[PDB]
Symmetry: D2
């Protein structure tokens, strides 16, 4: 899998399970087109969003539905979601892991990119 998303809970010290993730790709018309979506597993990970063939060069947006996550735990969080916007595969195919560590009023996101 060339694209994996991992979400972690900084309040509980655990994976963030059942978190909705939507991925979009910027089209020629400059608009965000739907690309893939899924939900994190018991390990806080989301694999299988795409394939090397489908995951061509482009500008991608990964929207992590953090508000729904926090609300379901009784917390009214600051953010609507966490968004990660990046150019992918502009130097050939790479493998991307996008990670987000979540708190009610904060998040930290990083990427690990391998060849």
């Amino acid at each position: 899998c060339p694209l994996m998303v991992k979400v972690l809970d900084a309040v509980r010290g655990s994976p963030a399970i059942n978190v909705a993730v939507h991925v979009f790709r910027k089209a020629a018309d400059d608009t965000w087109e739907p690309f893939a979506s899924g939900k994190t597993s018991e390990s806080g990970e989301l694999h299988g969003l795409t394939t090397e063939e489908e995951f061509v060069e482009g500008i991608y947006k990964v929207e992590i539905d953090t508000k729904s996550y926090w609300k379901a735990l009784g917390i009214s969080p600051f953010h609507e979601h966490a968004e990660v916007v990046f150019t992918a595969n502009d130097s050939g195919p790479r493998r991307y892991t996008i990670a987000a560590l979540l708190s009610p009023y904060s998040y930290s996101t990083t990427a690990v990119v391998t060849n």
Copy 2:
């Protein structure tokens, strides 16, 4: 000052100076309409974005132009920009400070909301 944005550089250990920041407000048709913008000061801060009268309840997006910042320093960045999307609510939180701590492949963002 109901809204302040502060940007820090984790590579240099300094404020992130001359960073472009664009604020948008969610419209009825769900499109993002320009609301306010500026460039961070020598202290990494951007004040005077809006007034209490103009800063009504609503969904806001703050886009921090991190890619251009890193390009000027000669370090390959991952993100197109850093985005913070939140609902402004009158129920207490009067002053909003959105902070972002920047690295080439990561950012951490928080909100400090005080009465």
Copy 3:
């Protein structure tokens, strides 16, 4: 003010008030000798820890008493405290701000060093 410490709460989206902070300086025998301490203010800041005359080059440790902070709020924390260990150097960096953003199972710390 050559040294300032700032502590923020990622769960409440607020300064972390009344947090105990202890600063130590590395001695010849490699032991940590008490140097300065205090409690964060209503703004989450602790100023007046030391003076330019006293703040000589050396290795310093800043211990932020996060466990007690979280216990008072009724949230099970992971860490005993947050520690920041650094060498103070006269070669430019005149003012040191050590910041820590706190969650029950995580913290992010940065330094902003300005002339």
Copy 4:
């Protein structure tokens, strides 16, 4: 393995390889006794530090040698190391993953604790 350490590089967007890690356990005499040590692999991970039998209840300190890491890459970083101090196994055996995301003037650490 009940204790695993993962270290990530926020400048390169990669695992942080060959990072020295020392673990200590607080003794009866209130001093830090050596407990385990190792270095992160090509995946930025360090497994095999301890066993369920040896990893008894106690206060542990995980010292991640970040300064040596940054120096070897030509960077003069702010911190001497990153230290993670926590009580372990005080409610029975748990599995701990301690993660640190590194920048020259900043780091973020989190823990994932499973049963």
